[PDB]
Design a protein around this ligand. Structure first.
Ligand SMILES: [Ca+2]
Ligand SMILES: [Ca+2]
Ligand SMILES: [Ca+2]
Ligand SMILES: [Ca+2]
Ligand SMILES: [Ca+2]
Ligand SMILES: [Cl-]
Ligand SMILES: [K+]
Ligand SMILES: [K+]
Length: 55
DNA sequence: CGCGTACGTGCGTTTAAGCGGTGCTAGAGCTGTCTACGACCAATTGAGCGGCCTCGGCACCGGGATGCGTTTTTTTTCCGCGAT
């Protein structure tokens, strides 16, 4: 009875991939642990700066 | 190279940094405890990849328009000399 999958991006209201960003943080040798809001925050900042250059 | 004065020098006056010290207490830093949060795992599936087709944006062309650099002949300007 498994719930339909909503991407973490859609929950954060982002177009940039939260889930990918989390996975690059975890595998990029930055810290032993990555908190749940970190990729959400970082994807958001990457999205903002992308928008601003694109505008 | 020649002209004007901005900076270096020195000296006499004035300022406040440095020093050694005491006193007070904010907050750095440490300890132990509890628990929210992240890692890990296994199953499940949809986001995003590689591959493939299409047709309009863009590169490239020639032609014509126009912006502008250059020179020579033309009108205005700013002097510039003394002689007053
Ligand atoms: Ca944004
Ligand atoms: Ca914007
Ligand atoms: Ca593609
Ligand atoms: Ca082409
Ligand atoms: Ca041409
Ligand atoms: Cl976090
Ligand atoms: K202290
Ligand atoms: K905690």
């Amino acid at each position: 009875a498994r719930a339909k999958a909503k991407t973490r991006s859609s929950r954060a209201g982002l177009q940039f991939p939260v889930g990918r960003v989390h996975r690059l943080l975890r595998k990029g040798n930055y810290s032993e642990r990555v908190g749940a809001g970190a990729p959400v925050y970082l994807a958001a900042v990457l999205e903002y700066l992308t928008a601003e250059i694109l505008e």
